[PDB]
Curated annotation (Swiss-Prot), chains A, B, C, D:
PANTHER family: 5'-NUCLEOTIDASE DOMAIN-CONTAINING, CYTOSOLIC PURINE 5'-NUCLEOTIDASE. P(1),P(4)-bis(5'-adenosyl) tetraphosphate binds at N152, K360, Q429, Y433. It catalyses: a ribonucleoside 5'-phosphate + H2O = a ribonucleoside + phosphate; a 2'-deoxyribonucleoside + a ribonucleoside 5'-phosphate = a ribonucleoside + a 2'-deoxyribonucleoside 5'-phosphate; IMP + H2O = inosine + phosphate; GMP + H2O = guanosine + phosphate. The keyword Metal-binding applies. This is Cytosolic purine 5'-nucleotidase. GO terms for cellular component: cytoplasm; cytosol. Its EC number is 3.1.3.5, 3.1.3.99, 2.7.1.77. It comes from Homo sapiens (Human). It is linked to Spastic paraplegia 45, autosomal recessive: A form of spastic paraplegia, a neurodegenerative disorder characterized by a slow, gradual, progressive weakness and spasticity of the lower limbs. Rate of progression and the severity of symptoms are quite variable. Initial symptoms may include difficulty with balance, weakness and stiffness in the legs, muscle spasms, and dragging the toes when walking. In some forms of the disorder, bladder symptoms (such as incontinence) may appear, or the weakness and stiffness may spread to other parts of the body. The gene is NT5C2. Widely expressed. DATP binds at R142, N152, Q429, R432. IMP binds at N50, D52, R200, D204, K213, T247, N248, S249, K290. ATP binds at R142, N152, Q429, R432. It is found in: Cytoplasm, Cytosol.
Amino acid sequence: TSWSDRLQNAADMPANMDKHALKKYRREAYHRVFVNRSLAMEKIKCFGFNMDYTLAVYKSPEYESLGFELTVERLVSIGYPQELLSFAYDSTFPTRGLVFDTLYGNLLKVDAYGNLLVCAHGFNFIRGPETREQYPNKFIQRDDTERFYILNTLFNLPETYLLACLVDFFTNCPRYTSCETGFKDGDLFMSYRSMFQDVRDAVDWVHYKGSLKEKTVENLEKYVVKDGKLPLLLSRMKEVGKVFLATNSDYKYTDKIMTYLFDFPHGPKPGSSHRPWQSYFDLILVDARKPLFFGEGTVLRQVDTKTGKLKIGTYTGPLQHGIVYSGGSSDTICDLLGAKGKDILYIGDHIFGDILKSKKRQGWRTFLVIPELAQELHVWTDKSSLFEELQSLDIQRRIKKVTHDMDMCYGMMGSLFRSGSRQTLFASQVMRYADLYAASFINLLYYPFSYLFRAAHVLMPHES
Amino acid sequence: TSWSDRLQNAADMPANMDKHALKKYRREAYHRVFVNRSLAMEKIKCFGFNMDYTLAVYKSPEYESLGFELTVERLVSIGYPQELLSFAYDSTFPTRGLVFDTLYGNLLKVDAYGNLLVCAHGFNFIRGPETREQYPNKFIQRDDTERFYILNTLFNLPETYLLACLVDFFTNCPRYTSCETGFKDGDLFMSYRSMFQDVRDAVDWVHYKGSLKEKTVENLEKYVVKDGKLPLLLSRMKEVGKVFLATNSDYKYTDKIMTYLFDFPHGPKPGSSHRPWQSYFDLILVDARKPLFFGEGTVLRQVDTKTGKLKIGTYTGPLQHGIVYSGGSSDTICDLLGAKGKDILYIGDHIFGDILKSKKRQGWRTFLVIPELAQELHVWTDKSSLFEELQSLDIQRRIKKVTHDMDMCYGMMGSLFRSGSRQTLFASQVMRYADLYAASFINLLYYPFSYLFRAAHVLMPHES
Amino acid sequence: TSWSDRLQNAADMPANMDKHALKKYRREAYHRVFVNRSLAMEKIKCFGFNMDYTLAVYKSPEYESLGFELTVERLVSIGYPQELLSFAYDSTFPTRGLVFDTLYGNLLKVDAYGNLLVCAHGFNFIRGPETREQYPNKFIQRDDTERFYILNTLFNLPETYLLACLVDFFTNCPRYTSCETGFKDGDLFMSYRSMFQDVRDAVDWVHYKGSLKEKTVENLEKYVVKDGKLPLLLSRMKEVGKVFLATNSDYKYTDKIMTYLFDFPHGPKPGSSHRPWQSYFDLILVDARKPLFFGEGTVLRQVDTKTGKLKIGTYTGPLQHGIVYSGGSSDTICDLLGAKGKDILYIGDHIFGDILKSKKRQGWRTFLVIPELAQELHVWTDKSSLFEELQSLDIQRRIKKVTHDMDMCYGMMGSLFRSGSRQTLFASQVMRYADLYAASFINLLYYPFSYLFRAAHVLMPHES
Amino acid sequence: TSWSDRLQNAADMPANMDKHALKKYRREAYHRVFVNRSLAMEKIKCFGFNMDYTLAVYKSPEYESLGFELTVERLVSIGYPQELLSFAYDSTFPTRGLVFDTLYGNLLKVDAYGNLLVCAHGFNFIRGPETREQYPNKFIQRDDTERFYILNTLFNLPETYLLACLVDFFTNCPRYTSCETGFKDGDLFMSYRSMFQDVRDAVDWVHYKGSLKEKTVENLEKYVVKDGKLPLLLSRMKEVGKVFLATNSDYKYTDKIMTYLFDFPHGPKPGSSHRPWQSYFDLILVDARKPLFFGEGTVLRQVDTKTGKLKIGTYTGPLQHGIVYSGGSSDTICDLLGAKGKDILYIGDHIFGDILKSKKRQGWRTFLVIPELAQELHVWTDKSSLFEELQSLDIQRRIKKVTHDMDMCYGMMGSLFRSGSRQTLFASQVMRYADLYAASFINLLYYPFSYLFRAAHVLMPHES
């Protein structure tokens, strides 16, 4: 059962908007919105969205496997060995948020302070004492971005697994000699760093010059979750405020995806006339170039929605009905919608490019969609006995074993949010920058128009 | 009663090292070490120190007033008007950690997300609605370091007050015309930014070319707290590990200050022979240039301790008894003491340059000394009824009034750690980067050699 | 008669290697090598080449017109108006080396000191007094590379004309309003700068993602000059030294072009067996990335010449027979050929990326190929009476008229080397950085193996 | 006979302003203005000056020796060995414009292309073949400013000699071991680079915090050339245009120096009333911060000429009589004097900071003062037989000997302008960027108000 199976199962349900049903529905962990900082929904005047893995939730593991296959094909096309074609995407290996160390070719799971929680070289998991040879303080400086790449996004899940596949392959292939920082093949030396660069280049190519989008839009039922409650929630948001889209994708792809997301024989509710997806938005902006978008951005352009090309020139006019923007900056949104940052709830899936940056640079309110939570919540509740035992032991060898047993329930790289009793960097960033979070933003449907999301005030140790 | 009065009162007490007395002493809030993250003291192999406001605690408000007077004199010397000489340092106005906005000339108290908690233009406190003209989202981007300067250090306390004095003076002096971003005097325009730059320049000059150090070392009993328990604690640290000094100050000043700090007719305990301050340290390093020290640092030099000058050349030798280093980097300490970062407890007063940077760049364990806590703890316990009422009301106009009444007990700029129920940026940084903290590191004396400092594990909302 | 007609006419001639014929041939201006600094050919141990417009001389105006058409088609494809399709390349307008001012949309011909010699807005040539409104000192700061782009290369000739076409078109099209820095079309504003950026982007796209190379290699007799004396000269160079190729082009294109350049039924001389082009080179390097090549360069790779793809890994081996390199740096050449810079004569057509940079960064000896000189020499000798009259007048209105009459013989933008008696920036750079220069490097064939190219010593005014 | 003796000898002469005497006087090489590019004096509307070594010509070798002594004293004060005190400035060693190579500790004389003409390690002159070990191509990349420092200014003459003294001293002192890149003293290693940095720091300190200015202004007759014709020339310039001062020095020093330069019992001519130096200038600007001055500069300030301090604020007013400016940019001059660049003749001694930068960045006309030419002209004419023989030989061992014999007449580092028949970088920069040049700008006195300075037009080799 993948997290997208859970999402699609809930997506298939019709909305029962009886007040008592909603209040009961939201109490269930899977339909709940979780709260890091208090947020009064009545103060929100604009609801903003990205598209990928928020509105358009790509099905798992089908989409990751497609991106993996095309990335492998691209690497082989540029001269990587044929054996790469025998790889096959394995969703049980990668957890999101791992750090690839380009010096030693390791995938690392770290806490918020750069402490090592898991270390794998290829598919070999390196235990604590053996990591000290390469990591004498069991620690990395995360912000050394020349050395470390943090595989933060759901789009990074295939390349997370591919990196481990490649290290595994070159390590065990007799044509190559394993060295500390790469692989030697006679008069050729491939460092883990140049390997990583090829992989990054190939992933980028697949998404922006290859056939990934084309293969996606030709079989949208295979690749994209569809939920009839999406138009209902957006229509209700538009009754009490403004709704905008700000996506890094271009207009042609956005139009294809959004048209599918709204392709029902009805509008917001069953029995209502169907409405075009654009009608649900007060402002539509593509080619956003987040996170640069939240600083100086790029020049504001207008999409010719007939041809899908940009009109020539910087757009200097006002917000018009039916206009579609390209580029610009977050100030564009604020000026055109007459909003200040704390009036905006921005709903995204990119912990860095959507949530961290809109919070820190603009003071927007933030809703982080975490698709894997749809399944991790089930593992967390089903295996709570493991965690509680671990808590009790905390109050050594038994600790490591329960930690391992708990973690393996999530996959070979453990929970997105912890390893045993130790929280991941990703978990710490969710708590710090996401005001609200959930497996899907659809869970906002089950809360009244002026709900007060509440979180406990924080006290320092000397204040307790 | 200043915080240094509290510190000096505790400093005057002799150490009762009876186990039961210590356990009772540490229970009292004023002699306690507070814990943000668990720390097993038996794992610490090296204890590191800065000097200023950690070993050498400068008396308040005498030292701030001295630095204020010399800074004013420097500004007048370069052509600021004579009326500056009528200013007098007022310790009730500044709270540490305020942000000077060089665009509009305001001192701001903000939370961790850049939200405005207090705004003062000169000595005029600007209420919420009036701040929206300059701060439409009641928000600043803290990391716009061209515009905002965060007055983070105890050395910044005089210039915090001086900035408000200057804005107040120019605003109310008839020779000048107040403008949005500065003051006009006929054909001269002084922006708040250039004013701020002059003040910064003058503070730097006073500390490094003026008479501040000279005036300090000629009356050390007036300006520096002295505690006979300092040699005792350091001697006990040296019994179980290594002890090092890493200060930004130069050797001549360090020697004068440290000699005074150890100038008792005895050594670690009464009745013992006096020992030179250097004998308490396995490694002494001056001109550290933190925070650069925790990255590439500077070249390692050797101090000629006879002349107080640097020997010519990069020092390439080993750790020798009696050698004093200059410059280098944190890797110097680790290599020479054979330590890894998590073996080190570094004790400092600079939330950024000592604690944040040693944690994030090197994974050192951290102890933050917060001198003002020595008094803020008394206000917190004496006025707990105010905070509890505020907590109860949280569960509008009454809220603002109790908030104001609570805050004014700390000074015109409120507590270092909060305004009402809202935590400051400074408080959030203490919690995030200081593993331990206290009004003085001397409180470590009251804990056994292998104490386990404990903090509760953190859980995400969906895990609760 | 284009300069490539002249080159092809000389290329059709067989080589008469009788000593007396050669000495007579080289005396003629069209077959001469011109000398800025003395160079003893016997000291040259390596002869280096780029490919484009040196070995592969593209025919004019056919090649410029092809690149122009494809660039226009690309701009229309991205949304420029259909009227662009009515443009047609006009070789009489552009002279190489003009500066496009992106602020005011002008093409400028300047001297070495940034003084304006010619100014055209579209096809309107702006006389001296009218240029002072935009250029108060009749001067530009050439190195303000954010504002000025110097159209230095033969590849820039189509975009030189296209920029003037576009300014002309938008200026005279009623849908647009002309402004100081661009064109307004209702709520769209296209600055000359963003227009220029589109043009640059389109030129780059045409060369590296469009069909330019494909259209070139499918009709090489139309697009590329072919000379049976090329293998003869290279074979004679290899008898007395080493020969290398260092091109920015990739291997697949280089192989197609070079195979055509050597496709005769004979080798170096008529009657000799044909030899593959690679056999003429001691070292072959593609993807050179000049000018970066002459600093740190890029990592050295090996071309798999069977597949045309790069082998995986950095190449760490020695110079091997038949190996083809990719990337690297100029130090690669020096180390593998055992040469120092002054042992190398590097023959190129890029005044900046080939000649200036190899001279200034490495002290290579330099030979600049200037294809247009093949025709400009004819204009210079045929119209010498105009220049001599101008010289005599110099020793006002008559001066301007003779200047105009002289310049128009070269085209609407005058000689590459001067306007009247004033030398261009390009001329000054040739003299400063090109040790030798000629319309074709083939003119080296007509000089003996150890010729001493001589230039007069320079004296300062006070030394004369 | 130093060049300042020559200057002072001519300075002692009264001005004979009879037209025929002037025309005869200017024909003599020593009173001539030399011309690199034609300049019509009637087009000049503003005459601009720096002060140091233009208006205030410091006497040689007294001033160099003073700066040398104070720099040595500063180095000893910071811990360099006592033997430095036995050094004594020797004007026969340094020639201006040498390059210190901080990697290998050599002084190099180079041509415009970075080719080695002279190489000295300490006082050991390294012959051609031996330089190839460190300089395999007998070539340096001058613009590698991390490695090479070009000792361009007359202020650099003492540190040129001091660098050679230090390398010589450490090389021959038994306490130190000579290494390729520095000196080892047990556990200390001093690289030539850190040595160079100390020297630079000490020179800067001596000029801006030490006693150099103080010692200069207390004995101005010893240290500064004085010429009664200076007020005459400036007064005549003011009759036909505007006159401005733009100096890097501060106002207090400028006032002391300029007051001395004008301290005669008369004004422009004998018998006329004395006038204050300021009255000779339409615009006075100090703290210019050239070369930054010729780009964005610094904010414009006003000097309070009563106190010598800056008024507080940016000066926003107009040009007023008696106002003195500080900072600003070259656009300040142009706007306030209503001038364009080619209307300005700027007279300076800094080949880079005055002449190169005003030419390249602003298109100013330029006059370079070269004080040493006052003597080098005498050597050039007295030893012309040596140069002519060298010219004849050029048309091997005899060549080297005549080259050495010629060069030694100028000093151990040869002529500022050449070594034998090879021109220096400095000579090439004079020709390229100085429109006019002379040993003193006073030679402009001997030319009529609207003289046309003429230089021959330049022709390319193919145009001859």
